[PDB]
Each structure stands twice: as structure tokens, then as C-alpha cells.
């Protein structure tokens, strides 16, 4: 009778084919080569397969390669192989919506995973870590862009801010794994990283918008700076209200408490993210989600474990989609060897300066050498925000119909995709490798 590897592979192949077949039967034309749903399904499966395959390979002392690399490569190959790309087409609206949902999921997970006492202690350190390295890297990257690539100063800073914020999608899962393992919990390193990795996005996007407006001489800088400040304020206020609400109302004496709480947090986070994006305040949604989830977890205390488990399953489902879509954004047209060497040089030097700055920001915080080194190497990952706003400058330049500005926007896009590819895999691998060693386990 059936047993062993053959039965498992038969069942998995059957489930995959059956899911596609069911979707095709219900929809029909969407789930066929060229249609949207067929593209989504194929991208999902390819991302999962790539993650697994890359995870398999482990020859050297370094742990198995991160599945992030596999998912990114799957998306990249789907985008760039000619015929596969022609057949597998995903509508932009759907891709953006799925990526937004994945971001909301991970932000909720991070907010739930925070520790109140650690946050109360590492108060200034979080602000420094969130706002120092981003600014310093933006400035140094602008310098490099002006001198090497030849961009003017405004475009240099646009590039520096695009090549800015760290990615919560990469940092949060690894820090949650480490926190579950108990590494660095005594000093609350995972809490510090998870909290700081969700604020610098606001500063990076604010700087990007301001410098873009300066470059195209549109609107005013004061308006964009005030937009950033209002983003912070309204995000905090809305998150606080929602968190204090869901922290009380689904009561401890209801029939399906876990399900209702999970739906409330996830739905409120999705609503915040999408409505804020649609209302012209992209960045208030993430902060509102973080604060809401933090307050809800603080209120629930022990009961939050089941909600965390369900959201972890949701993230397991959604991570392949997010990273496959990010990879599918990358096009080899922008990675032409015309000047790719200089773009790589600027990205590498900016990353080195970012590492040094991050080490100096957490210097006077009570950490020891190993913890500071781990923190510096855990601030590298960049993704899910370089892909979101990488090509905005190029689109604006095209709208203005200026050739020089198109050239500058193309350099910006090349550098964004470079930074993603270079830093996300190495960053995740370094987090995984250096977690157990440098951090101090608590048992």
C-alpha cells in the first residue's frame, strides 16, 4: 500500500493540480495561460518551489541558503524568461494589493511580538537606530551618486532616500524566530529591531517625496514635511484608539474569542493600510497597525499566543507571494552592464557606511560587542519598499517628458533593484547565522 516519499509527492502534486483545476472551473478564462489568476497561481507555486530548493542546499559551514533568495529568483526568472513571462501576466492592481496585504500581516505579527518592558527600557536607542542610519546612508549615497554616477544633488538625495529604509518583511520573521528561541530576550534585542524597523520607512518615504518635489519643482517642501509629520501623528492616534478598542471589547467570555480577535486585528490592519494609501497618507497605515497590534497584545497578555499562531500561518502562506512579486518587479533591462559596475559600487559603499553608522548608534545602550555587531549586521535587509517606490522617479520623469530626468530615474531604478538583490539574501542569511552565536540565550 502507499507509504513514504512517493505517497507524499503524489498527494502534493494532486493538491497543486486540483487547486488550479478548481480555480479554472470556477473562473475559466482567468485561470488559463495569459489570464491573471493563472499568473498568480504559477508565481505562487514557483516561489514556494524555489524557496524549498534553495533551502535544500547546504554544503559549507554557513547554514542553508535563505528561502528569500529562492523566492526572489523564482519571480525574477518568471519575469525575465521570454515565453514564461509572456504567459504569466499578473495585473498591477492585484500585485500591489497582495504585497500590501503581506505587509499588513507582517506588521501585525511584529506589533504582537513586541515586549512592553523592553520597549520601555530601550527608548532612545530605538529612535537612534530608526532615524540615524537611514539619514547617514541617504547622505553618503547621495554623495556617491553625485560623484560616480554624475547625478545632480537633488537626484542624489532621491536615490539616497530610495536606498533607505530597512525591510520589516525580512527583519521581523527572523527576530520572531530568535525571540521564540529565547536569544537576546534578556536585553530585548528582538523587540528593539522589530520596533525600529517599522518607523524608518516613514522617514525614508518623507525624504523621498520631498526630494522628488524639489527635483521636479512641484508643490512645496513644507507641504511634504508636514505630510510626514501628520502621517506620524494620525497613525499614532488612530492606532491608539483602535488598540484600546479591540483590547477590551471582544470579551474573555465569548464563544469564538480567538477567531474574532484574529479577524479584528487582521482586518483593522488591512483597512488601515489600504485606506491610508488611498487617502494620500501612505505610512500612517503601517504605524497605525503597529501601535494597534502592540496595544492589543499588551491587553491580551497570554491569550495572544493563539492569535500569533494563526497570523504566523497566514504569513507562511503570504510570504512566497510577496517575495515572488518583488522579484517579478525586477527586469534585466534595467540591469544593463552599461554602468552596472558603478551602481554596484555605490550600493556597496552605502551599505558599509550604514553598517558603521548602525554600530555607532547603539554604542551607548548597555549592549556588549557581540550584540552591537549582530544589530549592525541585522539592519541590512532592504526590500518591499525599494520595489514599491523604486520606479516612481522614472515614471515622473517620463510624465514630464525630459530625457535627462529619464536617465536619472533609470539610474535610481537600477540602484533600487541592485540594493534589493544584494542586501535581502545576504541580510537574511547573516541574521540567521549570527543570531544563535552572538546573542545570549536565556533559559
Amino acid at each position: 500500500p502507499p507509504h513514504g516519499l512517493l505517497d507524499r509527492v503524489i498527494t502534493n502534486v494532486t493538491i497543486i493540480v486540483l487547486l488550479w483545476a478548481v480555480v479554472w472551473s470556477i473562473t475559466g478564462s482567468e485561470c488559463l495561460p495569459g489570464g491573471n489568476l493563472f499568473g498568480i497561481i504559477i508565481l505562487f507555486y514557483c516561489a514556494i518551489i524555489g524557496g524549498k530548493l534553495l533551502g535544500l542546499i547546504k554544503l559549507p559551514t554557513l547554514p542553508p541558503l535563505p528561502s528569500l533568495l529562492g523566492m526572489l529568483l523564482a519571480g525574477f526568472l518568471i519575469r525575465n524568461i521570454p515565453v514564461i513571462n509572456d504567459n504569466v501576466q499578473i495585473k498591477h492592481k492585484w500585485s500591489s494589493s497582495l504585497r500590501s496585504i503581506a505587509l499588513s500581516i507582517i506588521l501585525v505579527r511584529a506589533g504582537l511580538g513586541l515586549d512592553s518592558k523592553a520597549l520601555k527600557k530601550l527608548k532612545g536607542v530605538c529612535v537612534r537606530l530608526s532615524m540615524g542610519p537611514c539619514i547617514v546612508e541617504a547622505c553618503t549615497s547621495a554623495l556617491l551618486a553625485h560623484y560616480l554616477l554624475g547625478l545632480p544633488w537633488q537626484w542624489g538625495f532621491i536615490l539616497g532616500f530610495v536606498l533607505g529604509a530597512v525591510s520589516p518583511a525580512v527583519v521581523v520573521p527572523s527576530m520572531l524566530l530568535l525571540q521564540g528561541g529565547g536569544y537576546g530576550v534578556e536585553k530585548g534585542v528582538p523587540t528593539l529591531l522589530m520596533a525600529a524597523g517599522s518607523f524608518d520607512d516613514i522617514l525614508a518615504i518623507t525624504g523621498f517625496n520631498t526630494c522628488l518635489g524639489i527635483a521636479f519643482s512641484t508643490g512645496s517642501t513644507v507641504f511634504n514635511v508636514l505630510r510626514g509629520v501628520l502621517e506620524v501623528v494620525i497613525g499614532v492616534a488612530t492606532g491608539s484608539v483602535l488598540g484600546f478598542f479591540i483590547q477590551y471589547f471582544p470579551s474573555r467570555d465569548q464563544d469564538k474569542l480567538v477567531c474574532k480577535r484574529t479577524f479584528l486585528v487582521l482586518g483593522l490592519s488591512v483597512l488601515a493600510v489600504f485606506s491610508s494609501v488611498h487617502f494620500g497618507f501612505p505610512g500612517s497605515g503601517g504605524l497605525c497597525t503597529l501601535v494597534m497590534a502592540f496595544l492589543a497584545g499588551m491587553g491580551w497578555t497570554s491569550e495572544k499566543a493563539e492569535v500569533e499562531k494563526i497570523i504566523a500561518v497566514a504569513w507562511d502562506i503570504f510570504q512566497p507571494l510577496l517575495f515572488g512579486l518583488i522579484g517579478a518587479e525586477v527586469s534585466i533591462a534595467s540591469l544593463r552592464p552599461e554602468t552596472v559596475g558603478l551602481c554596484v559600487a555605490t550600493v556597496g559603499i552605502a551599505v558599509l557606511i550604514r553598517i558603521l553608522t548602525t554600530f555607532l548608534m547603539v554604542c551607548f545602550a548597555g549592549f556588549n560587542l557581540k550584540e552591537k555587531i549582530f544589530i549592525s549586521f541585522a539592519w541590512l535587509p532592504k526590500a518591499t519598499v525599494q520595489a514599491a517606490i523604486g520606479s516612481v522617479a522614472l515614471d515622473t520623469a517620463r510624465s514630464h517628458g525630459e530625457k535627462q530626468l529619464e536617465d536619472y530615474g533609470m539610474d535610481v531604478l537600477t540602484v533600487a533593484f541592485l540594493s534589493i538583490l544584494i542586501t535581502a539574501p545576504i541580510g537574511s542569511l547573516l541574521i540567521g547565522l549570527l543570531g544563535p552565536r552572538l546573542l545570549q540565550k536565556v533559559e
Partner: antibody, heavy 121, light 108 residues
Amino acid sequence: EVQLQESGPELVKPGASVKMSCKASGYTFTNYFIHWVKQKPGQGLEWIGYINPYNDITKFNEKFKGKATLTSDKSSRTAYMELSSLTSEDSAVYYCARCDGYYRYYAMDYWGQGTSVTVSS
Amino acid sequence: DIVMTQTTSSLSASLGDRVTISCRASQDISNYLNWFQQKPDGTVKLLICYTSRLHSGVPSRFSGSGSGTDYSLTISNLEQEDIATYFCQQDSKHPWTFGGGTKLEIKR
């Protein structure tokens, strides 16, 4: 090889509308910009507008803003242009050329064959 | 706009000489002065992108000199094939504007 083939010669009456077709083979269709150029006989060329067959965004010369309408279909790998309320001044050869949007020295470098449009009664 | 002007609309040239085509813009395009060739049968092919960047597959005779706002195109030696109409384009600004064109006519 790369080739763009467009519809054949057309005959129309004043005030009517015509659909131009430009189909390209030999390259990733959604990887390039499709530009339209109108050459009236005797006179020189003059740019009309372009369509991005990736997100279907367009840009039009101010002169043809409203007179023309660009569309594309990825599955058929073809692009179409609509000329509305044709007059005596809209009878000329129409070209379609591709252009790499993500190259610092982009140009057209690949044109159609020319689709004469005649607006007579 | 950036209406371009080609000084000579029809210049004679033998079958073994070097000819020059002059294109002058009504502004300062940095170097975005593509060149095009249209043959009498109506087929138009790119020749020179970005002033002097010879295109791929173009014979080495075509030399796209010129800079500033007074560009030019040169033919090393003239072959019977090179008898056609040559347009100078500009993509520096939004509305791309072609030149008036020039026709090469064999001397006799």
C-alpha cells in the same frame, strides 16, 4: 528577427473613424514602447504619441491630443490607434516604431511599413 | 517648441564622394539628436542615436558628428544605396520633433 507589421491601406470618408493595427514579432512585446508617427505626403514626419504595452499608459503630442487613441493587447501582441472625425488633413502614411524605455540612449530603431489613410468622399 | 531646420532640402552628390547633412535646432538640445533614413520605397531605418552613437548593423560610413545645437551627419563615400531622405530627430524635450528632411540626388 524583429518585425512590426501594420494594417494595409485604408479608405475612409470625412467625419468617420479608422482603426490602425500594428503587430510585432521577434521580441518581448511588453518590453518596449510603441510610438506612432504620421507623415503627410511631401512634408516631414511628426510624432503622434506612444503606448506602454506593460501598464497601458500613453502620452500624446498636444496637436493630436483627442484626435488619436492608442490601445494595445498583450495576448495578440498588437497595438491599435484610433483616428476620430477624419478630415482632409488626416490622409497620410502612419508608422509604428518601438523604443526601449529603459535604455539611456533609447531611440526607435524599428519601424513599421506605413499604412496609407485616405479621407475622401 | 524645438522646431528643427535642415539647411538644404536637396543637395547633389556623386557616387564616390563624401557628403554632409546639416541639422540645426531652435533651442539647446544637449546631444539628443537621433538621425533617420527613409528610402524612396517608404522604409525608414534608424542611423545614429545620441548625436554620434552609431547604431548596430549600420555601415561604418555613416559618421554622426556635430554637437551643441548645430548637428551634422557625414557619409564617407556615397553608394547607390545611400540615395534617400535623411531626417534629424530630437527627443530632448517632450514633443519629439523631426526635421524637414533632405533628399540626396546624383550629380549629372
